[PDB]
């Protein structure tokens, strides 16, 4: 099972490869905002699942599919992202919804 990221604003989908992908300020997500680290978080696709680990002092945020609040993630800990969940690299910007691929 694979995954894509759907920006909450409706922009193009972001394909994720198996394994670990460093995300943040860079070409993959297109983020240029200096408040976002070039090494902001790790995404891991493995065994049909996706998890994220923040690796910067500037935080990441997580919104379960059933809730309606972007909550801050604890640093350097893994959090699984289910299809329909969202995460963000700023409190109110660069938000991405998780989509599953067959």
């Amino acid at each position: 099972g694979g995954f894509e990221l759907q920006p909450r604003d409706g922009g193009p989908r972001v394909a994720l490869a198996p394994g670990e992908t460093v995300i943040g300020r860079g070409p993959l997500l297109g983020i240029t905002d200096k408040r976002v680290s070039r090494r902001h978080a790790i995404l891991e696709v493995a065994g049909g699942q996706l998890r994220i680990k923040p690796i910067h002092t500037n935080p990441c945020f997580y919104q379960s599919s059933e809730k309606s609040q972007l909550l801050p993630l604890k640093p350097n800990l893994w959090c699984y992202l289910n299809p329909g969940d969202s995460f963000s690299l700023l409190v109110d910007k660069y938000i991405f919804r998780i989509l599953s691929i067959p």
Binding site: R25, G26, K34, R35, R38, H56, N58
Partner: peptide, 7 residues
């Protein structure tokens, strides 16, 4: 456009 130090 992705270089430079983080705030």
């Amino acid at each position: 456009p992705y270089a430079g130090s983080t705030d």
